[PDB]
Design a protein around this ligand. Sequence first.
Ligand SMILES: [Zn+2]
Ligand SMILES: [Zn+2]
Ligand SMILES: [Zn+2]
Ligand SMILES: [Zn+2]
Lengths: 364, 364
Amino acid sequence: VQEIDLGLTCDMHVHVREGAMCELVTPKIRDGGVSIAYIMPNLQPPITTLDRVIEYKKTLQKLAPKTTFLMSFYLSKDLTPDLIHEAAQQHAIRGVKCYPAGVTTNSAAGVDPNDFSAFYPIFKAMQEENLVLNLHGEKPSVHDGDKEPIHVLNAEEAFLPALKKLHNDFPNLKIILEHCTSESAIKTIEDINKNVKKATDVKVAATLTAHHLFLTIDDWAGNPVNFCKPVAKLPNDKKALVKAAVSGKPYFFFGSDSAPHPVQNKANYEGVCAGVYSQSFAIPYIAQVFEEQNALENLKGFVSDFGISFYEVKDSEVASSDKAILFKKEQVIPQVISDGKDISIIPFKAGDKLSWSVRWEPRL
Amino acid sequence: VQEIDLGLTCDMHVHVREGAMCELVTPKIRDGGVSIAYIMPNLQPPITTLDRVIEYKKTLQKLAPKTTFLMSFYLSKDLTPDLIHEAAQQHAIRGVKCYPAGVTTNSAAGVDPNDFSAFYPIFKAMQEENLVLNLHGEKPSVHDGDKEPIHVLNAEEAFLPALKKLHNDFPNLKIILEHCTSESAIKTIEDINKNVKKATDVKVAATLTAHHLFLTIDDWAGNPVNFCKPVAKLPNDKKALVKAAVSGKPYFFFGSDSAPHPVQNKANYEGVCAGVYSQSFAIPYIAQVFEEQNALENLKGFVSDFGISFYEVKDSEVASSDKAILFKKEQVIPQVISDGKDISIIPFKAGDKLSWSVRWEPRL
Ligand SMILES: [Zn+2]
Ligand SMILES: [Zn+2]
Ligand SMILES: [Zn+2]
Ligand SMILES: [Zn+2]
């Protein structure tokens, strides 16, 4: 079987939830072929306190002893600059994730984004402390006047001006447009990094999920199991993300947005929960695209190199120095992922064949 | 004003199924304020023979005597121009309805819209007998990658060329573009009727549903109840359909497309059935749209006159010359339409209030 060494792999957008769900999915981070995981904080309630995030990281480290965990705060009106500084100095967090209110699950009441000026004290303190501003780029939907009607298809593109203002008001702050879905957003990321030579110049990057390199609007319309925010869009949008994923540019790297929901949460007739679960076969999904694209020698940077560089992951904090190795062994995706009790999750592309699997090799 | 005499109301797109479902639904045609209802032909199996269409027509009449029924054939390959003449002369069918294969419910027995040519002998006979060609304007999806992509959002615009073909080759065959959903579809019907004013001149018309005058993509994104085919598109498309509804022009009239499924066919995690139920409150729905647009002087034309003028409904067939009186009593839409036995339906706008009601009054 043909194999590739990938080193310390990166998933900079992981949802892992609480409770018995968190105990089922957290070990599957390693099973997906991921050594370093950036944990998003949209919990119930959102993680806004310094106590919470210290307790939470140890819960994950008890669950996954070999996986590196970069934590984050939920951007709320609760946070104050001192809390940013004390948490950053204790290595409690690595960034703060911003949720526009009413545009995804666990996000209300979060922030108003045709604004952001209210949180400039926080961005001041994050900029000083080298933290990362993760943005769920989506303007909340307003349909009437005065301005343009905003819907699930232009919500990401309508947000882009606000991302441009933030990069100008805080040029030295690290910002990420999380999970890109539209070609207009891709063009904006390239344009912001127009002059950039070598990766350490990148201050504004974009992450790309596994499922948005596969899905279009047709795959989720009438299929709540492919429903997520931001919505998978037109075929030309998908072509852009796939082109961007294989491009080998240092401002696009992997972030699954693996968001587990029990199957009863997805089989509603109103109010379907949003989020696709890709944790269990994370890198095997991505290697499938790159093989299909005949660009495998760029995969090493998309799932490992470009992300460590951006988040400045030093060897010292990494929980284990084992490498993730793909090997071309064909496997079939289960119908369900389940704890054998109350929680059963439907995996992305369930019942399909993948060319690669993942094992782990120590360092010598 | 409160109380408006509507006369003989027209719903030129009604789904009633069979079995225990039909016994809950066909009484609600009357309940919704509809006296004349066109019945669609997609059953298990599709309605294609004179035996079934007449026995269907007869079971309908035992379950709702006062309702006038206009019946239809499924456009299947098991059809002959002989079968057209032997059903048109024996006053059994008012038209034949074209289903593209795979796009919607029970459409697996449908047709391939990239080549209508095999059915040209059928449309030749349908033109001879002054029958109505009901078209579900939607090309089936083509991921392709070579030729242009066809998806659920642009499938209606893709069908519009094929319709301007059918109108050139059968210039006297009465054709309807069923449930319009896009501004491209509306502009085309305006362009086809460049020079008509009143009213029997229209041979290519377009029917508009209740829910498509309400819904945008945001309303069915994570709400399977509001998922139907063709899908509800963008706010610029809804504005076009509303402007064309309170238009007062003869080529737009009412066709609810009330398609009922048992709620368990909606609360699926994949493969959710398509179709919204609106038969129980069909006329009060449209009444609220025509009220909120300050164009109630056009409700009678949209929901009665133009539909009668196109199908040329004669006095000699209407099952009950009772009049639909729309009176302004507030009513609340139930959570669940129920039969006390097995079948449970979720109605359109379930829970919401309506500004109007409708009762029945005989002519005297
Ligand atoms: Zn998000
Ligand atoms: Zn997320
Ligand atoms: Zn249809
Ligand atoms: Zn229909």
